Amino acid sequence: GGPTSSEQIMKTGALLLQGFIQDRAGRMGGEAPELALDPVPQDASTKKLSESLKRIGDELDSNMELQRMIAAVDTDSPREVFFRVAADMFSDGNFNWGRVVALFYFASKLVLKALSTKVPELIRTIMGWTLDFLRERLLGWIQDQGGWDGLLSYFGTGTWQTVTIFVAGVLTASLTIWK
Numbered sequence: 001g002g003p004t005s006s007e008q009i010m011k012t013g014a015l016l017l018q019g020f021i022q023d024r025a026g027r028m029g030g031e032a033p034e035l036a037l038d039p040v041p042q043d044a045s046t047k048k049l050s051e052s053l054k055r056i057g058d059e060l061d062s063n064m065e066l067q068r069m070i071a072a073v074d075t076d077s078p079r080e081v082f083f084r085v086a087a088d089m090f091s092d093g094n095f096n097w098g099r100v101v102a103l104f105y106f107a108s109k110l111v112l113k114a115l116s117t118k119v120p121e122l123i124r125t126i127m128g129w130t131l132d133f134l135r136e137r138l139l140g141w142i143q144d145q146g147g148w149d150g151l152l153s154y155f156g157t158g159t160w161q162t163v164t165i166f167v168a169g170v171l172t173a174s175l176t177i178w179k
Contacts, residue, residue: 001146001147003146003147003148003149004143004146004147006135006139006143008147009134009139009142009143009147009148010131010134010135010139011040012046012049012147012148013104013130013131013134013148014040014127014131015040015042015046015050016046016049016050016053016104016148017104017107017108017127017130017131018037018039018040018127019039019042019050019053019054020050020053020054020057020104020105020107020108021108021111021112021123021127022039023054023057024108024112025111025112025115025119028120029119029120029123030119030120030121030122030123030124031119031120032119032120035120036120037120037123037124045149048152049148049149049151049152052151052152052155052160053101053104053105055160056101056105056155056160056164056167057105057108059160059161059164060105060164060167060168060171063164063165063168063172065168065172066168066171066172066175069171069172069175069176069179070106070109070110070113070175071113072175072179073110073113073175075110075113075114075116075122078110078114078122078126079129081110081175081178082106082107082110082126082129083129083133084174084177084178085106085171085174085175085178086103086106086129086133086137088174088177088178089102089103089170089171089174090137090138095138095141096154097150097151097153097154097155098154098163098166098167098170099167099170100138100142100151101151101154101167102167102168102170102171103130103133104130105167105171106171107126107127107129107130110122110126111123111126111127114126
């Protein structure tokens with residue numbers, strides 16, 4: 001399977017994270033135009049997947065408990081908090097798509113806080129952390145699931161707002177451990 005190839009899984013991860021960031025920070029992704037990361041085009045399927053992730057992210061953006069905990073995160077040096085939260089969400093050795101979405105949402109939120117200073121740098125740095133965690137911890141599971149396509153089934157039509165309560169809850173819980 002082509003979507004089961006590690007290269008395709010990484011590329012879709014990068015494109016999903018990029019689109020998440022370029023929604024609330026605008027073109028240039030970061031800031032400095034000579035350092036902007038080009039938006040790599042999405043095929044129809046990846047666009048459907050990005051649009052779904054946008055709506056789930058918008059729902060998470062209205063979860064005030066989650067937003068309070070995200071806001072508490074120091075974005076000067078976010079290495080420690082990012083990796084502790086990422087590890088914590090997967091510490092039971094299990095995987096599900098809600099945790100993946102929670103991770104990519106969290107990564108994108110951290111970048112948009114670092115919107116203060118060094119955005120193209122924090123964008124690259126946090127994107128790198130996220131894709132490294134994807135490759136080291138999640139890629140095999142995504143391969144065994146047949147690619148990114150399975151994400152949509154986790155939220156279901158007409159139940160995705162219910163599912164997002166549980167997504168917010170796992171991310172909120174991890175951030176509480178590091179509060």
